[PDB]
Design a protein around this ligand. Structure first.
Ligand SMILES: [Cl-]
Ligand SMILES: [Cl-]
Ligand SMILES: [Cl-]
Length: 163
């Protein structure tokens, strides 16, 4: 575990993370995809061997000894708000199980279902709160990656609000 487990946020490419493992915002089919998933495919393509997994689950594949946790958030274009919310919470719970199982002291994590899978809605708060629900009981240092300056501010405020 980390000596004083923390949450931090960074505005940069998660493919350049400084953590002991990465969470991919994966598609269920293990395809290279777009956004976070395409960056993860370019950086850790070996981790896409048998990475396909259902919505609401996480499947870890090693790239060398570096773990890539493929977490499949719901596409809110396809799910109802209710079912999508349930699956988004579940994906994060599976990430917490994997991070725990791997024994890492740190993890780089994107906000699941906030991009192409958001169904055109702002889901920062919904996705981050499900991340917290899942990760709060873990003792890894969590580093949340985002790309938008306004998101960085909002994520940072939500972290600081709890401390
Ligand atoms: Cl960058
Ligand atoms: Cl997404
Ligand atoms: Cl972002």
């Amino acid at each position: 575990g980390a000596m004083a487990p923390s949450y931090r946020v960074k505005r940069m490419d998660i493919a350049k993370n400084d953590e002991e493992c990465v969470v991919n915002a994966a598609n269920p089919r293990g395809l290279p995809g777009d956004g976070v998933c395409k960056a993860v495919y370019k950086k850790w393509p070996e981790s896409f061997k048998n990475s396909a997994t259902p919505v609401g689950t996480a499947k870890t594949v090693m790239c060398g000894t570096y773990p890539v946790i493929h977490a499949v958030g719901p596409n809110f274009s396809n799910y109802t708000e209710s079912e999508g919310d349930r699956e988004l919470a579940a994906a994060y719970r599976e990430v917490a199980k994997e991070v725990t199982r791997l024994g890492v002291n740190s993890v780089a994590i994107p906000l699941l279902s906030t991009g192409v899978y958001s169904g055109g809605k702002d889901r920062l708060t919904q996705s981050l709160n499900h991340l917290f629900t899942a990760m709060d009981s873990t003792d890894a240092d969590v580093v949340i990656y985002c790309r938008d300056k306004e998101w960085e501010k909002k994520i940072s405020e939500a972290i600081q609000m709890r401390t």
